[PDB]
């Protein structure tokens, strides 16, 4: 199979910026290379087919070019409706293969995370389990680290993190760290701390509580 290679999986840019996505084929596919666009929970859309032919409805600020083994997709005036994942695809050799995709981020100003810590609920305690949740919402850039300390002592066992894709309204990110314990080990301790290190503050944002 012809291998489709996009050299970066993530790309960052500003509104009004010239974006360029590269795509390399392991073989000569001549001009048979298409470009697709796909938003997070959405359908796949054809942008350009053959090497540089736009599909109806696609803005002229999208342009493709390349022949043989090296292709590229250029966006001229990045708009926030251009924040999607872009795939390259060869249509001439069986089986037809796609590239890994290039997810395009948008740039904005630095935002500090709003940190909120929550204790286990009486309902979950009722089940012999106990999860401490921490929300770190609306921050930029995406680079952030979290530290859990149970009675001054760090901890990574039982900790789980999840991230949101870039927000549509404010282009920020959000994260959730959940320290799950056993009801019993939860009660042989008093204090629980949620620490956030971010490009903004120099000193962590600390959210703690105790029983």
């Amino acid at each position: 199979d012809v291998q489709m290679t996009q050299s970066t999986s993530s790309l960052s840019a500003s509104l009004g910026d010239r974006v360029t996505i590269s795509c390399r084929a392991s073989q000569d596919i001549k001009n048979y290379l298409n470009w697709y666009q796909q938003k997070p929970g959405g359908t796949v859309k054809l942008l350009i087919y053959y090497s540089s032919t736009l599909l109806s409805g696609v803005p002229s600020r999208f342009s493709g070019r390349g022949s043989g083994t090296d292709f590229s997709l250029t966006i001229t005036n990045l708009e926030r409706e251009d924040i999607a994942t872009y795939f390259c695809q060869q249509s001439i050799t069986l089986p037809p293969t796609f590239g890994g995709g290039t997810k395009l981020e948008i740039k904005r100003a630095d935002a500090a995370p709003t940190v909120s810590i929550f204790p286990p609920s009486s309902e979950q305690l009722t089940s012999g389990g106990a999860s401490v949740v921490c929300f770190l919402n609306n921050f930029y850039p995406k680079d952030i680290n979290v530290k859990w300390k149970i009675d001054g002592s760090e901890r990574q066992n039982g900790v789980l993190n999840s991230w949101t894709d870039q927000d549509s309204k404010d282009s920020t990110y959000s994260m959730s760290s959940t320290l799950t314990l056993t009801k019993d080990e939860y009660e042989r301790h008093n204090s629980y701390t949620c620490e956030a290190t971010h490009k903004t503050s120099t000193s962590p944002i600390v959210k703690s509580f105790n029983r």
Partner: protein
């Protein structure tokens, strides 16, 4: 205009069978060679099956060949994909797609110009399990201030997805629902909502979590303390 809608997706056991459907509109179905393409949990697009006009020839990659079968009903405007002997590697979002042109001399012929929303196939021996929903309320002296964040913990369910709304959708702004993490073959995600400290506890915020797989709906009113 042009419509493609996949159907038949669901939860299957390894080695099991499933049949998919694609109803079409806005074009002469009988003029096109129709295909199936799947997207992988790793966001990886892969070809599945192709069929020409007249259902005379069908193309399958070595990944699906000998197990899947593509067919068409030109009178019903429907395309099918019989899947058999399924493995976990077949877990994916399956789409039906239409080429850009029925004419091989047109370069749009070598492109898929229309896809459907897709239908989800999960091949697992794991069991359909309803979610437990826990209220996340602040505690216990930090009542400051401008805004307050509430949340709902949706825990130990299978399969995906779970739908989470706040106040029956009345609360759209300030909502953050996170991707589920797998843990003991059971999913867990979290949802946060931010409201002025004025409309809470005064006035009500409640999380509504729907899990269609187990036909479950849970309403969790967030109460102080």
């Amino acid at each position: 205009e042009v419509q493609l809608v996949e159907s038949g997706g669901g939860l299957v056991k390894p080695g099991g069978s499933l049949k998919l459907s694609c109803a079409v509109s806005g074009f002469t179905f009988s003029d096109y060679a129709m295909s199936w393409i799947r997207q992988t949990p790793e966001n990886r697009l892969e070809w599945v099956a192709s069929i020409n006009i007249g259902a005379t020839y069908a193309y399958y990659p070595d990944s699906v060949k000998g197990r899947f079968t593509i067919s068409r009903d030109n009178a019903k405007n429907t395309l099918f994909l019989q899947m058999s002997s399924l493995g976990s590697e077949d877990t994916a979002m399956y789409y039906c797609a239409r080429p850009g042109s029925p004419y091989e001399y047109d370069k749009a012929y070598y492109s898929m110009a229309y896809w459907g929303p897709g239908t989800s196939v999960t091949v697992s021996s794991a069991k359909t399990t309803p979610p437990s929903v826990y209220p996340l309320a602040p505690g216990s002296a930090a009542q400051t201030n401008s805004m307050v964040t509430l949340g709902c913990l949706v825990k130990g369910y299978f399969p995906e997805p779970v739908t989470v709304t706040w106040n029956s959708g009345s609360l759209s702004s300030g909502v953050h629902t996170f991707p589920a993490v797998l843990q003991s073959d059971l999913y867990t995600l979290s949802s946060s909502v931010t409201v002025p400290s004025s409309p809470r506890p005064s006035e009500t915020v409640t999380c509504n979590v729907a899990h269609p797989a187990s036909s479950t709906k849970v309403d969790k009113k967030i109460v102080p303390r």
